[PDB]
Subunit: 306 residues, 4 copies
């Protein structure tokens, strides 16, 4: 299930000091080509709402929004704070892996080294620099380029059964049905439907949700991802890889060996409906991370533009 | 009383974001000819400028590579050959590069389009139940234009200098830049560029000084130009003494305010190739009920 | 049954500008008397651990502890210099938590009904943190209180070693248990009630923990309120989550906080204290249950210590 | 080399907290004769001293009274109306105890605990020497030593408080230290903070700061103190090297308290001549933490 590093890796492909990995496949020419896909100006946000009500993998805590001062305060007391202008201010506490996200190459690995031989000792507490190598700031202008939706739900004409493993054949079959063709630097966005089952669940159902096996991609997608020179793979599930009822070889192979970024908890329902209606599954994607030095991932609001 | 109330209907919660139309996004995309990209964000960390008493953003790890050096058997999520690092942030949503929502500021008892201030509540009571930033989760992706006031003036701006309508129009003309409806205007004042070289005393003084920014007479012009948003590389956008513009932009016009953007590298590039118009991806995070958002604006040429 | 305010309240008892409520029952003489109960020097912490594993009423977040710098950092990088170059090595940490997220006192600013809080304080006085928080009845008003005499009433043992799910603890139960224990309450006492509920939480799996908060929970009922008033208690704490019985109106919250100005303690841990009291027969002790000094807050975490 | 490793056994994680015994708590309780109490905490808010780069504590509300003014129908969770709140803070961000896991030198902490035992919270935090090991400690006898009044005025900037000063102050007060005591030291430093403007507050931490010096450590050992707390930020004198931190936390297993507020207690003791008191200075029960906020209460 875990592909041997020596037979399948991108270490050294972009130099022995590179910290960007497969983001290097997104070059200026790939961005210009993506821009030519903005023909209609349609836009879609591929994020879930950042609030305390969304899926987040235990033991991670849900994002938590609080206000510092509100409109209600001025109803209560017109004389709040220091001028005729009235204002509201707020705060957030959240896991950076707590919502729609990119995971950096510093997020996961196996053994004592990360992508391109970076030692795990380089990934420290925040007060010691956090991810001092392979931090998400290395890709603060990346993931703006060409995106491609693969709608596995519509390809399967049904429910992915509980814990279904999405294969190479499934991905290629869906792209063929769509008459889509991948290019180097593409960000692949996979619709599994899993997040579309969350919000209707009651509290017991939401506990069960994470105890269940969960649909996602399998090990035989990893050579394909390498062959297609994708920069990142995102999905509308929580762990990208299929999760059983714990090896996680796809995480290890993508992040450490290929230097390919992982996107999770994206929201693809409205994008997928639009692509079904206009037949265009390739689009311009603005999926830049936040500029967070030493972080091992970021929340974002990916925008698909057609 | 100059205002846009009702312009887009009595139920509208998006304001001047409605100037960004699909056709205008298509036009902006045609500006992507080289593929050059520039992040207009400052780093999110505890060392950036933030208006007191706002807390600096604060990053912590939940588990790190160092933990596995210390204890190879670390199993945050159970026994696995896979090793992981996870992290967290606490920050003001007004604590870094930001958009301010229309729910961020007003005067009197009403916000944009007659929304009562009673609609803007604690997070447990819905936060901004109207005019929350989620209303523009697909906005601020379109055409951007830089106006470089430092370059126009030929020197660093005086402490507390009021940037006038004449300065904005004059600088755009010298650049041969033409604004279009729906544009996001990004203003280089230079103020934030001074921050990172400051020592702790300098950083305290930074917020005691008057601070350069736009003045009241820019508001009719911003209205006439049908801008969707105005952002700057200062902390408060408008000039601050040792806030009429906030009130008029957010409440009366429904025009968004961007603060603590980073424009130094973009400004050098635009001076070189002569192009101050670009495609801008400056979408907010999707945070329902929030009164603003962090972001990472990307200028694309 | 919500007890009518006019028949049962302490408004004005300690003046119409008072913000401390029943904490005023704890007097220097009552503290001196409580200190005389320190005869053996046995100590018991009545707190649950502050971590992300404890009971917290949804949608409140679990407390969350993170490190800023750790020993592991120096294993990975001996030269780690967080402050900076030094032979001394440091570890530092942070917490994010609800102040109602663990073992707690709830201030009189935490709960009320209608438009007024204890002693006629307008609800408009309780604002966002940036506008002063609880500008009246904040927990700082009792930064020196809740150190005095405590009395355990072990309702679990009184009822034979267990309480049914959702059981309503009555006046008669409280008096009956105190009589069995040969305990006598005095004005100013902090009453600590063992319901056993928190003793069932930690073995639950994620589904069980979700169910825990969806179903009825044992606690005190409405007819305990006049008794609490009678007895001139300063505060009432329990090892459940809501103090009063919760169904599958919450009049007790309203009557205690608003009408009487009596403080509510929740998610205390009483199992070891109760075992000790069963063995030595002493249910009255010195209690150090001071809140944190947090101006404008509507409650506080704490580590209550029973001293015998 | 002076140290307590092994004094309380190889498995011990409590250090000098073991000097506080039941009999010593009983003795301390007899000092409660007036029933007067004093909080020795500063307010937890964003306005207090906190050593950079630590951030100030930050209080926010989840729901407030104002919400029901704006919207009578607010239903966060009823006729009952509720206010709920949150705190984000460094555990070293206010009045505090520092655990034995907070500081050391070399690769070993108190009693030979490896520094590899002190990990991220997701990996157990301080898996040994966490503050939970003393969740019932620091309730016992406290003694104030008022160095400000002993010196007859405010201490000079960066003044090193010596063994002779501590002994001299105790002698002037007619105080007698006993084993198990918690020593509480008034330097006055925190009493200068709140009147400072933002520039002064920046300078405050760049300046040398008054505190105890190296020659106090053998005396702290000989006196069998459980912990030493002060109303400065770092306990030991800080220059522009921190041997006292290392010797106390790693070698002796003695706890360090910082940012205590002693103004009102010190005034009371000067008036009635009593500098010994019952102290309730328990930490919060935070497993794997390397310190804790608290509200220490002195009772006389």
């Amino acid at each position: 299930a875990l592909h041997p590093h020596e037979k399948l890796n991108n270490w050294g492909k972009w130099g022995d000091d590179d910290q960007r990995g497969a983001a290097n496949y997104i070059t200026p020419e790939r961005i210009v080509a993506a821009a030519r896909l903005i023909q209609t100006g349609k836009t879609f946000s591929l994020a879930i709402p950042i609030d305390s009500n969304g899926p987040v993998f235990p033991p991670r805590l849900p994002p938590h929004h609080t206000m510092e001062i509100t409109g209600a305060d001025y109803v209560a007391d017109p004389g709040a704070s220091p001028s005729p202008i009235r204002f509201a201010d707020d705060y957030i506490y959240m896991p950076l892996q707590g919502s729609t996200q990119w995971d950096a190459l510093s997020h996961g690995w196996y053994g004592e080294s990360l992508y391109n031989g970076v030692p795990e000792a380089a990934i420290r507490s925040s007060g010691a620099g956090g991810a001092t190598k392979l931090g998400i700031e290395n890709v603060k202008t990346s993931f703006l380029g060409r995106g491609v939706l693969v709608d596995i739900v519509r390809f399967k004409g049904g429910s992915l059964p509980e814990g279904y493993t999405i294969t190479r054949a499934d991905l290629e079959g869906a792209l063929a049905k769509q008459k889509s063709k991948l290019l180097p630097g593409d960000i692949l966005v996979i619709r599994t439907g899993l997040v579309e089952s969350w919000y209707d669940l009651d509290p017991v159902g939401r506990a069960s949700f994470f105890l269940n096996p969960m649909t996602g991609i399998g090990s035989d997608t990893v050579p394909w991802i390498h062959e297609q020179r994708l920069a990142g793979v995102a999905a509308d599930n929580i762990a990208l890889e299929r999760v059983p009822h714990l090896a996680l070889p796809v995480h290890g192979n993508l992040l450490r060996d290929l230097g390919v970024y992982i996107g999770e908890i994206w929201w693809l329902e409205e994008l997928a409906k639009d692509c079904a209606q206009d037949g265009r599954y390739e689009f311009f994607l603005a999926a830049q991370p936040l500029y967070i030095p030493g972080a091992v991932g970021s929340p974002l609001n990916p925008i698909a533009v057609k």
